[PDB]
Design a protein around this ligand. Sequence first.
Ligand SMILES: O[B-](O)(O)O
Length: 123
Amino acid sequence: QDNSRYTHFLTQHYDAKPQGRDDRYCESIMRRRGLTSPCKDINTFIHGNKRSIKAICENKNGNPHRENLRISKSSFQVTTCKLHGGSPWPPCQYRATAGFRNVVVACENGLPVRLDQSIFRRP
Ligand SMILES: O[B-](O)(O)O
């Protein structure tokens, strides 16, 4: 149930076990999560379990980062979906970059609520 900022973060940025990690996967998941109206230019999904992501908000799996962000201690499997072409309007074609990296989040009440998306602009 999507009734919190935490849960909405999961809807936007969490996919436990990605079926594949290619361009087709991106097109499909971006649509399924409601990020193709208008087409979001870049979005990153974090894989694996949820508790590893939550733990970024505490010393268990996070460190302070910049003014009030958190950076993970562990690395995460992630897939970044990059809008192909300029257009803000469907069909939204996407290119996937599968990666393994540290995640930065903004936390509220011990829960991640926002991803620093710009860190995934570069492969
Ligand atoms: O024990 B640590 O947080 O990996 O340094």
